[PDB]
Amino acid sequence: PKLSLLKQDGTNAGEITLNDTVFGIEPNEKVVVDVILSQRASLRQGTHKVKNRSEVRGGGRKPWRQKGTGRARQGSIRSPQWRGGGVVFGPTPRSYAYKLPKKVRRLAIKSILSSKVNEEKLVVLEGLTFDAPKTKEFAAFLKNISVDTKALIVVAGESENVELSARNLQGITVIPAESISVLEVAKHDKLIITKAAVEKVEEVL
Amino acid sequence: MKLHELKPSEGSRKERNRVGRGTGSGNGKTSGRGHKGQKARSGGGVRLGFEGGQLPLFRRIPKRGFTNINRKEFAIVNLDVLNRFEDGTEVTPELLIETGIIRNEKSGIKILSDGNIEKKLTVKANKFSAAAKEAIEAAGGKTEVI
Amino acid sequence: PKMKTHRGSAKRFKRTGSGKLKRRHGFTSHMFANKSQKQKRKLRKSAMVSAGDFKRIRQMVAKM
Amino acid sequence: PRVKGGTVTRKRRKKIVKLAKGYYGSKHLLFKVANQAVMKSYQYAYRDRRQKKRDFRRLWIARINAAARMQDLSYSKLMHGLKLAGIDINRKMLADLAVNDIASFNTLADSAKKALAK
RNA sequence: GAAAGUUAUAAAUGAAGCGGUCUGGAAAGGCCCGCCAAAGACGGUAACAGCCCGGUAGUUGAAAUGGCUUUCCCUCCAGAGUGGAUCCUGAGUACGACGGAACACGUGAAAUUCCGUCGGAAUCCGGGAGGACCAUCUCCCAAGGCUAAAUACUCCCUAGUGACCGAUAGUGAACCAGUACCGUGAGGGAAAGGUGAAAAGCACCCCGGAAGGGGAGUGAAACAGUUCCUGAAACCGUGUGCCUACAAGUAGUUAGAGCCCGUUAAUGGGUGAUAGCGUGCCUUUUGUAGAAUGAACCGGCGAGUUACGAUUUGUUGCAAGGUUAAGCGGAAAAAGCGGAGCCGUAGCGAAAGCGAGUCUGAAUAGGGCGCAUAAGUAACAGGUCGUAGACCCGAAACCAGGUGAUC
RNA sequence: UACUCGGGAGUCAGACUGCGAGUGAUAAGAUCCGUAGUCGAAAGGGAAACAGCCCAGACCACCAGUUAAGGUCCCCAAAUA
RNA sequence: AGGUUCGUGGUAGGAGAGCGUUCUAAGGGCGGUGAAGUCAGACCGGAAGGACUGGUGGAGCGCUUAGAAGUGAGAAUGCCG
Ligand SMILES: [Mg+2]
Ligand SMILES: [Mg+2]
Ligand SMILES: [Mg+2]
Ligand SMILES: [Mg+2]
Ligand SMILES: [Mg+2]
Ligand SMILES: [Mg+2]
Ligand SMILES: [Mg+2]
Ligand SMILES: [Mg+2]
Ligand SMILES: [Mg+2]
Ligand SMILES: [Mg+2]
Ligand SMILES: [Mg+2]
Ligand SMILES: [Mg+2]
Ligand SMILES: [Mg+2]
Ligand SMILES: [Mg+2]
Ligand SMILES: [Mg+2]
Ligand SMILES: [Mg+2]
Ligand SMILES: [Mg+2]
Ligand SMILES: [Mg+2]
Ligand SMILES: [Mg+2]
Ligand SMILES: [Mg+2]
Ligand SMILES: [Mg+2]
Ligand SMILES: [Mg+2]
Ligand SMILES: [Mg+2]
Ligand SMILES: [Mg+2]
Ligand SMILES: [Mg+2]
Ligand SMILES: [Mg+2]
Ligand SMILES: [Mg+2]
Ligand SMILES: [Mg+2]
Ligand SMILES: [Mg+2]
Ligand SMILES: [Mg+2]
Ligand SMILES: [Mg+2]
Ligand SMILES: [Mg+2]
Ligand SMILES: [Mg+2]
Ligand SMILES: [Mg+2]
Ligand SMILES: [Mg+2]
Ligand SMILES: [Mg+2]
Ligand SMILES: [Mg+2]
Ligand SMILES: [Mg+2]
Ligand SMILES: [Mg+2]
Ligand SMILES: [Mg+2]
Ligand SMILES: [Mg+2]
Ligand SMILES: [Mg+2]
Ligand SMILES: [Mg+2]
Ligand SMILES: [Mg+2]
Ligand SMILES: [Mg+2]
Ligand SMILES: [Mg+2]
Ligand SMILES: [Mg+2]
Ligand SMILES: [Mg+2]
Ligand SMILES: [Mg+2]
Ligand SMILES: [Mg+2]
Ligand SMILES: [Mg+2]
Ligand SMILES: [Mg+2]
Ligand SMILES: [Mg+2]
Ligand SMILES: [Mg+2]
Ligand SMILES: [Mg+2]
Ligand SMILES: [Mg+2]
Ligand SMILES: [Mg+2]
Ligand SMILES: [Mg+2]
Ligand SMILES: [Mg+2]
Ligand SMILES: [Mg+2]
Ligand SMILES: [Mg+2]
Ligand SMILES: [Mg+2]
Ligand SMILES: [Mg+2]
Ligand SMILES: [Mg+2]
Ligand SMILES: [Mg+2]
Ligand SMILES: [Mg+2]
Ligand SMILES: [Mg+2]
Ligand SMILES: [Mg+2]
Ligand SMILES: [Mg+2]
Ligand SMILES: [Mg+2]
Ligand SMILES: [Mg+2]
Ligand SMILES: [Mg+2]
Ligand SMILES: [Mg+2]
Ligand SMILES: [Mg+2]
Ligand SMILES: [Mg+2]
Ligand SMILES: [Mg+2]
Q: Do chains C and D touch (3 or more CB pairs under 8 A)?
A: no
User: Into how many domains does chain D fold?
Assistant: 1
Q: Are B123 and B91 in contact (CB under 8 A)?
A: yes
Beta-bridged to residue B128, according to DSSP, are: B111
How many residues in total does chain C contain? Answer: 64
CA A27 to chain CA centroid, nearest Å:
20
Amino acid at A94: R
CA of D54 to the centre of ligand 66 (A): 14
C13 inside 8 A of chain B by CB: yes
Q: How was this structure determined?
A: cryo-EM
Extended strands (E) in chain A: 2-6, 12-17, 122-125, 153-154, 174-175, 191-194
User: What is the secondary structure of chain B as a DSSP string?
Assistant: --GGG--PPTTS-------SS-GGGS--SSTT--SSSSTTSTT----SS--BTBPPGGGGS-------TT----EEE-SGGGSSS-TT-EE-HHHHHHTTS-S--SS-EEE---S---S--EEEESEE-HHHHHHHHTTT--EEE-
Three-state DSSP state, A71: coil
- Å between A158 CA and nearest CA of chain B: 30
Q: How many CA atoms lie within 13 A of B122 on its CB side?
A: 6
Q: Which residues contact A54 (CB under 8 A, 6 or more apart)?
A: A86
Residues of chain A neighbouring B1 (CB-CB closer than 8 A): 32-33, 36, 112, 115, 186
* Closest alpha carbon within chain B to C27: B61
Pick among C7, C25, C46, C53 to test the B interface (most B CBs inside 10 A): C53
Task: Quote the longest CA-to-CA distance of chain D.
Answer: 89
Residues of chain C neighbouring B63 (CB-CB closer than 8 A): 11-12
Beta-bridged to residue D21, according to DSSP, are: none
Q: How far apart are CA B16 and CA A160, in angstroms?
A: 52
Q: Do chains C and B touch (3 or more CB pairs under 8 A)?
A: yes
* First CA to last CA distance, chain C: 17
Interatomic distance D5 CA / G60 C1' (Å): 20
Domain extent at residue D112? 1-116
Q: Which residues contact A169 (CB under 8 A, 6 or more apart)?
A: A135, A138, A139
Interatomic distance D10 CA / G16 C1' (Å): 31
Three-state DSSP state, A77: coil
* Closest alpha carbon within chain B to A186: B1
Three-state DSSP state, C28: coil
Residues of chain A neighbouring B2 (CB-CB closer than 8 A): 186
3-state helix, strand, coil in chain C (%, to 5): 35, 15, 50
Distances (CA, A) of B56 to A151, B50, B59, C29, C56: 69, 7, 5, 18, 11
User: Into how many domains does chain C fold?
Assistant: 1
Pick among B54, B57, B64, B67 to test the C interface (most C CBs inside 10 A): B57
Three-state DSSP state, A154: strand
Domain extent at residue C36? 1-63
Interatomic distance D20 CA / E262 C1' (Å): 23
CA of B19 to the centre of ligand 11 (A): 25
Distances (CA, A) of B97 to A122, B102, D47: 46, 5, 83
CA of B47 to the centre of ligand 9 (A): 28
- Å between C58 CA and nearest CA of chain B: 9
Three-state DSSP state, A27: coil
Burial class (CB in 10 A: 0-12, 13-18, 19+), B130: exposed
Pair type for strands A2-6 and B75-77: unpaired
Contact A187 B6 (CB under 8 A): no
Burial class (CB in 10 A: 0-12, 13-18, 19+), B126: middle
A45 touches strand E (CB under 7 A): yes
CA of C52 to the centre of ligand 57 (A): 37
